[PDB]
Scaffold this active site. Structure first.
Site, PDB file in Angstrom:
ATOM      1  N   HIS A 175      -8.630   1.411  -0.917  1.00  0.00           N
ATOM      2  CA  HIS A 175      -8.619   1.368   0.548  1.00  0.00           C
ATOM      3  C   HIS A 175      -9.555   2.429   1.129  1.00  0.00           C
ATOM      4  O   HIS A 175      -9.152   3.314   1.889  1.00  0.00           O
ATOM      5  CB  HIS A 175      -7.188   1.516   1.094  1.00  0.00           C
ATOM      6  N   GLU A 211       0.857  -1.189   0.000  1.00  0.00           N
ATOM      7  CA  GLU A 211       0.000   0.000   0.000  1.00  0.00           C
ATOM      8  C   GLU A 211       0.890   1.234   0.000  1.00  0.00           C
ATOM      9  O   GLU A 211       1.694   1.391   0.930  1.00  0.00           O
ATOM     10  CB  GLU A 211      -0.930   0.048   1.226  1.00  0.00           C
TER      11      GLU A 211
HETATM   12  N1  LIG Z   1     -10.363  -1.738   4.401  1.00  0.00           N
HETATM   13  C1  LIG Z   1     -10.493  -0.835   5.528  1.00  0.00           C
HETATM   14  O1  LIG Z   1     -10.617   0.354   5.311  1.00  0.00           O
HETATM   15  C2  LIG Z   1     -10.532  -1.417   6.955  1.00  0.00           C
HETATM   16  C3  LIG Z   1     -11.106  -0.715   7.981  1.00  0.00           C
HETATM   17  C4  LIG Z   1     -11.173  -1.279   9.230  1.00  0.00           C
HETATM   18  C5  LIG Z   1     -10.646  -2.550   9.454  1.00  0.00           C
HETATM   19  N2  LIG Z   1     -10.061  -3.239   8.433  1.00  0.00           N
HETATM   20  C6  LIG Z   1      -9.570  -4.488   8.628  1.00  0.00           C
HETATM   21  O2  LIG Z   1     -10.693  -5.480   8.572  1.00  0.00           O
HETATM   22  C7  LIG Z   1     -10.416  -6.549   9.298  1.00  0.00           C
HETATM   23  C8  LIG Z   1     -11.520  -6.796  10.273  1.00  0.00           C
HETATM   24  O3  LIG Z   1     -11.624  -5.719  11.156  1.00  0.00           O
HETATM   25  P1  LIG Z   1     -12.348  -5.942  12.614  1.00  0.00           P
HETATM   26  O4  LIG Z   1     -12.587  -4.611  13.258  1.00  0.00           O
HETATM   27  O5  LIG Z   1     -13.592  -6.796  12.477  1.00  0.00           O
HETATM   28  O6  LIG Z   1     -11.208  -6.726  13.554  1.00  0.00           O
HETATM   29  P2  LIG Z   1     -11.591  -7.632  14.852  1.00  0.00           P
HETATM   30  O7  LIG Z   1     -10.378  -7.533  15.754  1.00  0.00           O
HETATM   31  O8  LIG Z   1     -12.873  -7.203  15.533  1.00  0.00           O
HETATM   32  O9  LIG Z   1     -11.775  -9.195  14.364  1.00  0.00           O
HETATM   33  C9  LIG Z   1     -10.731  -9.807  13.731  1.00  0.00           C
HETATM   34  C10 LIG Z   1     -10.995 -11.309  13.813  1.00  0.00           C
HETATM   35  O10 LIG Z   1      -9.956 -11.925  13.234  1.00  0.00           O
HETATM   36  C11 LIG Z   1      -9.897 -13.153  13.910  1.00  0.00           C
HETATM   37  N3  LIG Z   1      -8.790 -14.001  13.606  1.00  0.00           N
HETATM   38  C12 LIG Z   1      -7.600 -13.936  14.208  1.00  0.00           C
HETATM   39  N4  LIG Z   1      -6.833 -14.913  13.688  1.00  0.00           N
HETATM   40  C13 LIG Z   1      -7.575 -15.576  12.787  1.00  0.00           C
HETATM   41  C14 LIG Z   1      -7.314 -16.647  11.970  1.00  0.00           C
HETATM   42  N5  LIG Z   1      -6.081 -17.396  11.872  1.00  0.00           N
HETATM   43  N6  LIG Z   1      -8.257 -17.095  11.150  1.00  0.00           N
HETATM   44  C15 LIG Z   1      -9.478 -16.510  11.115  1.00  0.00           C
HETATM   45  N7  LIG Z   1      -9.743 -15.457  11.914  1.00  0.00           N
HETATM   46  C16 LIG Z   1      -8.780 -15.009  12.741  1.00  0.00           C
HETATM   47  C17 LIG Z   1      -9.909 -12.737  15.377  1.00  0.00           C
HETATM   48  O11 LIG Z   1     -10.180 -13.906  16.239  1.00  0.00           O
HETATM   49  C18 LIG Z   1     -11.087 -11.733  15.303  1.00  0.00           C
HETATM   50  O12 LIG Z   1     -12.265 -12.315  15.639  1.00  0.00           O
HETATM   51  C19 LIG Z   1      -9.020  -6.249  10.113  1.00  0.00           C
HETATM   52  O13 LIG Z   1      -7.871  -6.787   9.334  1.00  0.00           O
HETATM   53  C20 LIG Z   1      -9.021  -4.725  10.107  1.00  0.00           C
HETATM   54  O14 LIG Z   1      -7.647  -4.158  10.290  1.00  0.00           O
HETATM   55  C21 LIG Z   1     -10.019  -2.686   7.184  1.00  0.00           C
END
Ligand SMILES: NC(=O)c1ccc[n+]([C@@H]2O[C@H](COP(=O)([O-])OP(=O)(O)OC[C@H]3O[C@@H](n4cnc5c(N)ncnc54)[C@H](O)[C@@H]3O)[C@@H](O)[C@H]2O)c1
Ligand SMILES: NC(=O)c1ccc[n+]([C@@H]2O[C@H](COP(=O)([O-])OP(=O)(O)OC[C@H]3O[C@@H](n4cnc5c(N)ncnc54)[C@H](O)[C@@H]3O)[C@@H](O)[C@H]2O)c1
Lengths: 320, 320
Positions: free
Chosen positions: B282, B263
């Site tokens: 993004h 990115e």
């Molecule tokens: N594209 C964007 O603009 C944007 C914005 C916010 C978040 N995100 C990303 O989206 C994703 C989800 O965000 P969130 O707030 O729901 O995070 P979250 O912390 O609430 O949930 C993440 C989940 O991933 C799970 N996880 C961990 N290891 C795992 C594995 N090996 N296999 C499957 N699941 C596993 C955790 O147990 C958790 O339940 C994150 O990577 C976050 O950084 C992207």
């Protein structure tokens, strides 16, 4: 002993197999006029894939014809007057694609809100930095205006109000306010209020003299400049030159169009130029599941007429 | 008396106004390196608009710097090691965009199912008759596989299972099966089962050593050839050369990508070529509403550090 002609394939082959078990079926795809004329001469039933036209000449040549079935709701491409003159039953196949159109409508609302096609083109052009200039819209709390609170209008309203947490207004002169309450929408008697309040306007009315070109230049002027129009209903609900003006003059922000006037559209349609108008080729009601239901209904009704049984969806009931 | 530098604008101006009430704010947009170097020399706080990089040189020049805040979750573009060496607090702003990403994910699932970008191009090219060759997918009854049942994974699961009537499977080693039941999904311990069962796979895990490049060529081989991949999580969850192979060799049917590795992406990214891959830059987490929340959080945490109050989201807590 009965022969049946399919002018275009059905939307799922199950209806063709059902017909072939009881009749002799011929299928012609994107046919020239002379092929229709030769194949229709002795058939007892005809199926017509939308939006292919069935004209007076072909009907006049169809010496044994007893039933014509369209593929879906629309019968504007059939010369019903000529069929009625000859006592030929015309049948459509309506109301079998509520879920398909509801999903398609949601897809289009979300695609406009998230600026999908534009952002996709920007990334592929190397312009990831467009994210410093444009942002998606969050649907939660925005107002969706639904015109026509029927089967599809109600289904769309229900998802947008509950799952997507939008404020939903509905305009429909033939419905009680309780029908909007059921799907957590508010019925409004003033179409102007729906236009001035809505961030998204989605059209789902029956096409009538009342709804014909109800979305004209005066309607677009009342809409918010930031708002989007979605039309999955019928092309004639919108006056196409006024939508061109409205898009070009920025009276509204964009549109998503699945239905056209005329159908099929010409290849130089003036709307094509605008990157904030997105199109699908009258496919909102044509998933495999909706297609199978419509194909079974069309096959059934043809067989019914051939066996002297009244089918449910006669368009010209005075011939029966 | 404190000065603050915004390296890029915030996602909403409310955070800039909050800062300007208590400090002297300067904003530089898409800056060259020499502008960062001149503007950072005497500032006490720095805000960094993702994915702009803040390197060791600039940190070393920032003689008065006490706090660095990113715009959102990701801190990979900050030289945290150099900040930690100098006792500088690094803060992110996570978890403020659940609704935005949930909606964006739905938009992408629906856009792939309804073949939105392809059908739009066909109509605008005069090929309305493409409707004789391609049909949309009906989401009802199809299986959605969610990887990561966190805040966004759960929200997406809940909408797809209830509003869209999909069958939802979820893979997440750190969650009880009851958490999937809550959103009418089924938890599955075998990732292979999710891959072989799913018609849509949407990635929402935290990026860890375990999830880094978990979606590689072997994963794509197990997916249905008809299935689609959606990634709004982190670019490093997918091994990009394998997704290129998978798309080119038709191991999967398409993809929708909001996050990249690296990115920002390079302008000659090999994925851009494929019409069945769609992109956003993004932006899934960047609606105005999510942006205002993140901008307030970033502004607050900067002011907190400047007043010697511990902020909630320190990334390098050992400096405090
Ligand atoms: N594209 C964007 O603009 C944007 C914005 C916010 C978040 N995100 C990303 O989206 C994703 C989800 O965000 P969130 O707030 O729901 O995070 P979250 O912390 O609430 O949930 C993440 C989940 O991933 C799970 N996880 C961990 N290891 C795992 C594995 N090996 N296999 C499957 N699941 C596993 C955790 O147990 C958790 O339940 C994150 O990577 C976050 O950084 C992207
Ligand atoms: N794009 C496609 O593939 C496709 C598929 C199916 C249906 N359609 C079209 O979608 C539209 C909705 O379908 P439906 O099954 O929900 O029809 P429906 O009969 O269930 O509902 C139509 C609604 O329109 C309302 N209406 C009538 N006059 C109105 C007016 N002046 N103003 C506002 N509303 C008015 C009726 O009261 C009714 O509630 C119809 O035009 C239908 O032909 C399109």
């Amino acid at each position: 002993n009965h022969k049946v002609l399919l002018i275009g394939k059905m939307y799922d082959e199950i209806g063709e197999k059902l017909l072939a078990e009881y009749t002799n079926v011929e299928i012609i795809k994107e046919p020239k006029q002379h092929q229709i004329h030769e194949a229709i001469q002795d058939v007892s039933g005809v199926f017509v894939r939308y939006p292919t036209k069935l004209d007076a000449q072909a009907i006049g040549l169809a010496k044994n014809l007893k039933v014509i079935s369209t593929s879906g709701f629309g019968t504007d491409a059939i010369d019903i007057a000529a069929a009625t003159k000859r006592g030929i039953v015309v049948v459509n196949n309506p109301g079998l694609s509520t879920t398909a159109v509801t999903e398609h409508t949601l897809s289009m609302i979300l695609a406009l809100a998230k600026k999908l096609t534009f952002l996709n083109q920007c990334v592929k052009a190397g312009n990831y930095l467009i994210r410093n200039q444009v942002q998606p819209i969050q649907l939660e709390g925005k107002t969706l205006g639904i015109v026509g609170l029927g089967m599809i209008g109600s289904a769309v309203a229900k998802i947008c109000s509950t799952a997507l947490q939008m404020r939903v207004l509905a305009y429909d002169p033939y419905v009680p306010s309780g029908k909007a309450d059921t799907v957590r929408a508010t019925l409004v008697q003033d179409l102007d209020y729906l236009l001035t309040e809505s961030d998204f306007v989605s059209l789902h009315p029956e096409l009538t003299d009342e709804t014909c070109e109800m979305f004209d230049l005066e309607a677009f002027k009342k809409m918010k400049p930031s708002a989007f129009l979605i039309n999955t209903s019928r092309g004639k609900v919108v006056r196409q030159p006024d939508l061109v003006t409205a898009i070009r003059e920025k009276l509204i922000a964009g549109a998503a169009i699945d239905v056209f006037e005329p159908e099929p559209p010409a290849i130089n349609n003036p709307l094509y130029e605008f990157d904030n108008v997105i199109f699908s080729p009258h496919l909102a009601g044509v998933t495999p599941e909706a297609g199978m239901a419509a194909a079974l209904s069309a096959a059934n009704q043809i067989l019914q007429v051939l066996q002297g049984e009244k089918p449910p969806y006669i368009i010209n009931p005075k011939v029966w």
